[PDB]
């Protein structure tokens, strides 16, 4: 997260870290046994780390649970990033508490201009790299479809939306992929891609979760 702020320990209790001997992507807990992340975050050997603040120190309230299923959307296109969504089933259910909690799925899509919370352990610099120990947070608005498409001609599918700031300086970044965009208490976005980070006229692009609520429910119900 570039241009954000320190969230505060466990203030984003649905935020998880995907770990393969290092943090590589975020995700969102949507019930005690299932996590939403990005399809491009798929790999073997994922350990889901819940209740985290400082990801480099065992502080208390962590739960480390192996992924037992990592389900990429069958129509994920790795070149366009269309359908960039993945469901992870935890090997055992997380223990839900004030510091480890699920986030609601949307019942309808969000509107341009609505303020959302984006969070993660990604790079905090728009030039070079600096990776934080503790979770970072950013308030950012959903942009209009025409502005999103104007920023990224020929690249925005109906399963994507833009959020952030065209003046630069505030954005998600490498390491935030798969993590949450939460608007009005609903998971509306998944950190996906962008041109650089926090660059002028290049907002973040996010998977449009409201288009996948039925697929998520049907996939969980059959697994």
């Amino acid at each position: 997260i570039v241009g954000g702020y320190t969230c505060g320990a466990n203030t984003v209790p649905y935020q998880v870290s995907l770990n393969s001997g290092y943090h590589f992507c975020g995700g969102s807990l949507i019930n005690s046994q299932w996590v939403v992340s990005a399809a491009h975050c798929y790999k073997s050997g994922i350990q889901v780390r819940l209740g985290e603040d400082n990801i480099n120190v065992v502080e208390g309230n962590e739960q480390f649970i192996s992924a037992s299923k990592s389900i990429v959307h069958p129509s994920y296109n790795s070149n366009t990033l269309n359908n960039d969504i993945m469901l992870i089933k935890l090997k055992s259910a997380a223990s839900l508490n004030s510091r480890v909690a699920s986030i609601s799925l949307p019942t309808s899509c969000a509107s341009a201009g609505t303020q959302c919370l984006i969070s993660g352990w990604g790079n905090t610099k728009s030039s070079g790299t600096s990776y934080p120990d503790v979770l970072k947070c950013l308030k950012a608005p959903i942009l209009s479809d025409s502005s999103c498409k104007s920023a990224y001609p020929g690249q925005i599918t109906s399963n994507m939306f833009c959020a952030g700031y065209l003046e630069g300086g505030k954005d998600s970044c490498q390491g935030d992929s798969g993590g949450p965009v939460v608007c009005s208490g609903k998971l509306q976005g998944i950190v996906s891609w962008g041109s650089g980070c926090a660059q002028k006229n290049k907002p973040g692009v996010y998977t449009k979760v409201c288009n996948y609520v039925s697929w998520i429910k049907q996939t969980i119900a059959s697994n």
């Binding site: 290092y22 943090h23 590589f24 992507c25 990005a38 491009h40 975050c41 790795s78 070149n79 990033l81 990604g122 990224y152 690249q155 998600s172 970044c173 490498q174 390491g175 935030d176 992929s177 798969g178 950190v191 996906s192 891609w193 962008g194 041109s195 650089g196 980070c197 973040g204």
Partner: peptide, 14 residues
């Protein structure tokens, strides 16, 4: 020049 926001990034020539 566009990249996924994973570690490591997956990037396009553009």
């Amino acid at each position: 020049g566009t990249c996924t926001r994973s570690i490591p990034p997956i990037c396009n020539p553009n």
